[PDB]
Amino acid sequence: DIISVALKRHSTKAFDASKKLTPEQAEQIKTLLQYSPSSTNSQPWHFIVASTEEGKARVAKSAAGNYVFNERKMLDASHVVVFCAKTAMDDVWLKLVVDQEDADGRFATPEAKAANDKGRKFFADMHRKDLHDDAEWMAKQVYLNVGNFLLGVAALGLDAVPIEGFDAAILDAEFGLKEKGYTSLVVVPVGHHSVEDFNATLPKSRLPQNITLTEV
Amino acid sequence: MDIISVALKRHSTKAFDASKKLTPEQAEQIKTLLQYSPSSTNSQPWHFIVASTEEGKARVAKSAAGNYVFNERKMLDASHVVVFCAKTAMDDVWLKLVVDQEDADGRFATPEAKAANDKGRKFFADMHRKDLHDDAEWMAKQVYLNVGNFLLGVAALGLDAVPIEGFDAAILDAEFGLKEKGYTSLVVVPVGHHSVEDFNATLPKSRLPQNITLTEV
Numbered sequence: 134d135i136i137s138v139a140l141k142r143h144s145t146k147a148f149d150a151s152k153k154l155t156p157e158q159a160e161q162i163k164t165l166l167q168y169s170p171s172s173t174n175s176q177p178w179h180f181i182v183a184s185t186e187e188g189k190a191r192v193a194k195s196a197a198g199n200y201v202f203n204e205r206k207m208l209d210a211s212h213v214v215v216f217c218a219k220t221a222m223d224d225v226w227l228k229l230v231v232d233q234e235d236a237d238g239r240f241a242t243p244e245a246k247a248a249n250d251k252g253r254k255f256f257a258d259m260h261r262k263d264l265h266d267d268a269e270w271m272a273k274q275v276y277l278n279v280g281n282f283l284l285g286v287a288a289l290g291l292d293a294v295p296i297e298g299f300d301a302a303i304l305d306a307e308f309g310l311k312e313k314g315y316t317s318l319v320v321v322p323v324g325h326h327s328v329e330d331f332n333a334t335l336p337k338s339r340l341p342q343n344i345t346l347t348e349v
Numbered sequence: 350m351d352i353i354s355v356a357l358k359r360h361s362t363k364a365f366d367a368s369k370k371l372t373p374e375q376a377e378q379i380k381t382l383l384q385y386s387p388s389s390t391n392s393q394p395w396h397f398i399v400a401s402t403e404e405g406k407a408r409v410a411k412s413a414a415g416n417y418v419f420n421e422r423k424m425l426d427a428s429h430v431v432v433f434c435a436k437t438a439m440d441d442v443w444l445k446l447v448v449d450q451e452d453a454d455g456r457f458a459t460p461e462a463k464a465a466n467d468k469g470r471k472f473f474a475d476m477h478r479k480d481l482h483d484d485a486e487w488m489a490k491q492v493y494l495n496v497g498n499f500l501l502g503v504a505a506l507g508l509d510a511v512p513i514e515g516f517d518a519a520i521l522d523a524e525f526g527l528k529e530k531g532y533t534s535l536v537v538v539p540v541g542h543h544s545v546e547d548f549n550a551t552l553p554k555s556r557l558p559q560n561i562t563l564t565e566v
């Protein structure tokens with residue numbers, strides 16, 4: 134079941150470059166990215182899915198300097214997902230989200246739509262006008278998406294590794310993200326592990342629940 | 350179902366049936382999901398409060414105050430309610446705890462492997478706690494990743510849930526003495542079975558189209 138998946142998945146340290154996702158799997162990973170929940174359904178994100186050699190090479194430019202030992206993961210995997218967050222929460226995006234919810238038939242009346250918009254703005258304004266942490270708030274939603282994604286891809290029988298060891302300034306510049314209103318946060322190569330993936334057979338290790346978990 | 354079915358079917362439950370409890374097996378399963386989430390460097394910079402008694406849930410629900418009152422019943426009515434907390438600072442005792450646990454579990458072939466893993470972990474941790482002074486946000490991001498893993502996992506178990514940011518973290522922290530223990534509350538997730546008042550159970554899901562959010566290269 135899903136608990137078996139959670140207990141058996143791992144962060145892949147080396148990919149077999151001959152092993153590709155099926156077209157079906159490639160569509161399934163896009164669906165996972167799209168259907169993640171987020172605060173107010175704000176979906177404050179953009180994904181770059183690199184599957185060509187040229188595309189993956191562009192992403193791998195970010196595995197520079199002290200991050201060079203992540204480069205092969207980006208090159209050898211089948212599909213490499215760059216998770217990006219918006220850099221500021223703007224009204225046009227808030228309108229885009231509520232209009233999409235309306236198109237999907239979530240509102241019975243104009244009043245219901247207006248109440249949803251008002252509630253979304255309560256949370257958005259708390260972050261972007263009061264706390265001034267909307268960049269962080271949106272980034273947190275993207276990390277939530279990554280968590281959904283890693284479990285989902287494992288459940289599809291695919292290997293992956295989440296990567297923070299990359300140069301986001303290089304990756305942003307490579308895809309012109311800043312000027313488009315986004316910034317790169319996590320890179321996740323997806324594919325099938327190779328024999329060089331020493332982590333595939335190592336035991337999982339987590340802190341005991343008697344440290345991390347209180348029942349009340 | 351496959352996992353894509355779960356992703357397409359799950360929803361944020363707006364009202365729970367307080368008579369429908371998790372089985373003992375399910376209660377163990379949700380704790381496993383919390384524990385086994387990945388995180389940057391396996392830093393696991395988190396604490397979970399799992400409230401299953403009516404007394405415990407009532408206390409968590411004290412945080413649904415003021416502008417957050419319309420999340421109160423979700424917290425009272427679900428079988429189990431999980432409070433996801435992050436560490437407020439990444440200290441060296443914790444970094445040692447994590448590498449010592451990895452060693453106990455058998456991840457290192459030699460003392461040199463263990464040292465190299467420790468060195469690599471500190472490379473990342475020090476970038477945040479020393480260069481950028483943003484380790485609190487870095488750790489909070491790992492907690493959000495855990496929440497994403499959790500919501501999909503509990504849905505795949507056939508359980509309803511809702512992630513909640515609409516709560517007063519000052520009240521919740523004080524209620525469980527979190528700050529003085531070195532933690533702060535970020536997300537509350539009631540888990541159980543929806544009630545007849547869950548208007549969201551039958552509404553269509555809505556997401557932005559991929560032509561807006563997704564570029565293939």
Ligand SMILES: Cc1cc2nc3c(=O)[nH]c(=O)nc-3n(C[C@H](O)[C@H](O)[C@H](O)COP(=O)(O)O)c2cc1C
Binds near residue numbers: 296297299389390391
């Ligand atoms: C946000 C995030 C960033 C990570 N960055 C890297 C990375 O740059 N390179 C790498 O090899 N592993 C990376 N990892 C993998 C972690 O070390 C791994 O998740 C952790 O040790 C737990 O092991 P598991 O993923 O096999 O369960 C990262 C994980 C997360 C969650």
Ligand SMILES: Cc1cc2nc3c(=O)[nH]c(=O)nc-3n(C[C@H](O)[C@H](O)[C@H](O)COP(=O)(O)O)c2cc1C
Binds near residue numbers: 169170173361513
């Ligand atoms: C971090 C986070 C916090 C949220 N906070 C609340 C909340 O306080 N109350 C609530 O009813 N729903 C909350 N939601 C639910 C979102 O509105 C919901 O995830 C989004 O509309 C997408 O719908 P779905 O979860 O049904 O797919 C939150 C979701 C996330 C991810």
Ligand SMILES: NC(=O)N/N=C/c1ccc([N+](=O)[O-])o1
Binds near residue numbers: 256
């Ligand atoms: N943040 C969200 O996604 N949605 N929040 C919904 C609600 C409903 C009641 C409250 N509340 O804060 O009382 O937040």
Ligand SMILES: NC(=O)N/N=C/c1ccc([N+](=O)[O-])o1
Binds near residue numbers: 200
């Ligand atoms: N951040 C992590 O969890 N683990 N990182 C592992 C590695 C391995 C190589 C690199 N790197 O940055 O080149 O990071």
